[PDB]
Structure 1
Amino acid sequence: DVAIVKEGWLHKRGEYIKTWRPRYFLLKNDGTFIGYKERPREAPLNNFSVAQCQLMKTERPRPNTFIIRCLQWTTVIERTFHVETPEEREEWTTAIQTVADGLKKQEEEEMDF
């Protein structure tokens, strides 16, 4: 069964309006990444799988930004996040990458040969 890998507050940049808002996110080891206006039902404001996604780091316009990029059909999806320190960013990007890598291993076990 599915377990929480990491949860906590992130600053998420809006997709239409590129302002930053605080969101409480939970990452689960099936790849679910779900974000709420408040600490958790009430529907989440964000809900997407990190499976088959890529992580990017950037420092502009905000230092300690990371981006999750998912290529899906024709669309590539980007979800942009900020935290207050580079150590905090590494906690999140390591957690997400580890979950994605677990799922990639599983995919390879299914597809190959």
Structure 2
Amino acid sequence: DVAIVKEGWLHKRGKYIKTWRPRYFLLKNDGTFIGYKERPREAPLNNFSVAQCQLMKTERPRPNTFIIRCLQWTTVIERTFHVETPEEREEWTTAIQTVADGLKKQEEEEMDF
């Protein structure tokens, strides 16, 4: 069954306004990545799958930024996050990567041959 893999505060850059705001995110092993205004009913402000997504690291405009990029149909979705240390970024990117890898292995076992 589906369990939380990692949860915690992330600084998220907005989609339309490119400002940064603190958000409480939860990553689940089915690829669910859900973000709330406060530590959690109250609906989430962000809700997307990390399945088939790409992790990118950047230092501008903020150090220790990571981007989750997902190509969906014609559209490309990007979600931008900042944490205070490069170690915390590695903490998050490793967790997201391992979940994505689990789901990729599952897809490949279904689609290959």
Instruction: State the TM bucket, normalised to the shorter chain.
Output: over 0.9
User: Cα RMSD over matched residues?
Assistant: 0.3
Percent identity between the two aligned chains: 99
Q: How many residues align?
A: 113
Q: Deviations over 1:19-58 (max 9, x none)?
A: 0000000000000000000000110000000000000000
> Structure 1 segments of 4 or more deviating over 3 A?
none
Hey, what does 1:21 align to over in structure 2? 21
Can you give the 5+ residue segments of structure 1 that lack an aligned partner in the other structure?
A: none
**In the TM superposition, what is the alpha-carbon distance from 1:14 to its structure 2 partner?**
0.3
TM-score by length of 1: 0.99
Q: Which runs of 5+ in 2 are unaligned?
A: none
CA displacement, residues 49-94 of structure 1 (integer Å, 9 cap, x when unaligned): 0000000000000000000000000011000000000000000000
SS of the residue corresponding to residue 91 of structure 1 reads: helix
Query: In structure 2, the residue corresponding to 1:67 is in which secondary structure?
Result: strand
1:1-113, aligned counterparts within 5 Å? 1-113=1-113
